Amino acid sequence: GDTFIRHIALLGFEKRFVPSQHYVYMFLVKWQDLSEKVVYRRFTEIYEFHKTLKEMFPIEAGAINPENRIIPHLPAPKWFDGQRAAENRQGTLTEYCSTLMSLPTKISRCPHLLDFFKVRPDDLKLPTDNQTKPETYLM
């Protein structure tokens, strides 16, 4: 078509400390030119992106007729301890991203989605403090 994403894989997550302590999920994004780029997104940013996508495509969100829903589900930020919930979260984000790429191309190649997964300055140059590195969890 143009510029678009061919594949989105979840590689794991990182525990960040700067500027504050939080988790980011690590995605490998394959583009139409076959480049593979790493980007990092917190769960709340993914969830907000999800809500924006549902608002754009109310038919596929099931907002008119719920049996017509094809946008994958994403459980709210429930901050839930134990790694059953953690195995559910990496698993549900993995499933979410794979299912996005099977949607009809009006959604899977929509510019809003492409823009969400484009590299940010801090995807290229991670924030550091001399007095503080992130813990990486590839799994």
Question: Could you explain how this protein is built, in words?
Answer:
- 34% of the residues lie in helices and 23% in strands.
- The chain has helices at 43-56, 83-100, 105-108, 111-117, 121-124; strands at residues 5-16, 22-31, 36-41, 135-138.
- A four-stranded antiparallel beta sheet has the order 3-2-1-4.
- The protein is globular and about 55 Å long.
- Residues 3-124 form the PX domain.
- It comes from Homo sapiens.
Q: What is the CATH H-level superfamily? A: Phox-like domain
Write down the overall geometry: globular
SSE-based structural type: alpha+beta
Counted beta strands: 4
First-last Cα distance: 33 Å
Q: What's the number of helices?
A: 5
The fraction of residues assigned to DSSP E strands is 15-25%
Tell me about the biggest sheet? 4 strands, antiparallel
CATH architecture: 2-Layer Sandwich
Under CATH at level 1, the class stands as Alpha Beta
Q: Summarize the helix and strand pattern as letters.
A: EEEHHHHHE
> Any idea how many domains?
1
CATH topology heading = PX Domain
Helix content: 25-40%
Largest sheet, order of strands side by side? 3-2-1-4
Rounded radius of gyration (Å): 16 Å
Organism: Homo sapiens
Protein name: Neutrophil cytosol factor 1
Domain PX: 3-124
Subcellular location: Cytoplasm, Cytosol; Membrane
